[PDB]
Amino acid sequence: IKQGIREVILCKDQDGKIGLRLKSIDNGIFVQLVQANSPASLVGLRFGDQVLQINGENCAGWSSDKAHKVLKQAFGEKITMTIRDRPFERTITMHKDSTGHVGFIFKNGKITSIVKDSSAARNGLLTEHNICEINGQNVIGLKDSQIADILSTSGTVVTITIMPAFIFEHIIKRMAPSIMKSLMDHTIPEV
Numbered sequence: 286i287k288q289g290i291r292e293v294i295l296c297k298d299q300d301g302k303i304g305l306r307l308k309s310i311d312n313g314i315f316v317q318l319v320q321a322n323s324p325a326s327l328v329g330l331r332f333g334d335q336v337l338q339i340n341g342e343n344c345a346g347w348s349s350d351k352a353h354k355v356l357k358q359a360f361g362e363k364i365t366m367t368i369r370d371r372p373f374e375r376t377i378t379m380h381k382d383s384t385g386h387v388g389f390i391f392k393n394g395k396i397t398s399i400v401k402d403s404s405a406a407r408n409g410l411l412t413e414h415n416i417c418e419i420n421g422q423n424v425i426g427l428k429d430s431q432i433a434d435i436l437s438t439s440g441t442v443v444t445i446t447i448m449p450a451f452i453f454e455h456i457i458k459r460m461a462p463s464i465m466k467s468l469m470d471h472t473i474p475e476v
């Protein structure tokens with residue numbers, strides 16, 4: 286989770302897409318889905334990011350619908366956004382023990398218990414928090430087994446980005462799980 290605000294310059298693809306769904310939350314606008322191989326993914330928008338301005342115009346108070354409308358009505362040449370980095374999220378760094386554990390249970394993406402004397406316990410991981418990213422990679426909408434596999438196939442150092450479930454559940458509402466599993470970019474970033 287980086288220092289406040291950054292600007293991004295987008296550019297509709299050949300189909301007039303940017304690869305983005307937005308969600309109105311507490312009178313802001315937040316990123317709900319970022320499509321793989323899209324302008325939004327290429328410029329590095331993330332799930333949970335706040336969109337402060339579009340084309341210089343403030344997003345405060347908008348409906349999802351208006352934000353989707355605004356994106357349609359826009360010369361594809363150059364769209365500028367002002368982004369606050371995943372404001373609802375935090376990142377925790379952990380270390381595995383000899384038996385390859387961080388020290389928690391989760392279910393449906395949501396952490397449900399911390400294990401005594403684990404790295405997770407020492408680092409202050411919280412339950413009732415949906416897992417959003419592991420080592421910079423978005424795992425929302427994946428299955429527990431696949432998240433479990435990403436954790437198994439990480440180095441010793443695991444970095445997890447987590448979001449309070451109440452907020453998470455409010456963000457992904459009206460979003461079909463399959464679309465999340467399919468289209469939400471789950472790739473390591475590109476250089």
Ligand SMILES: Cn1ccc(NC(=O)Cn2cccn2)n1
Nearest residue numbers: 393394416424425426457460462
């Ligand atoms: C409506 N809806 C879409 C997705 C969803 N739940 C999850 O994605 C759970 N999860 C969090 C991280 C990994 N899976 N609900």
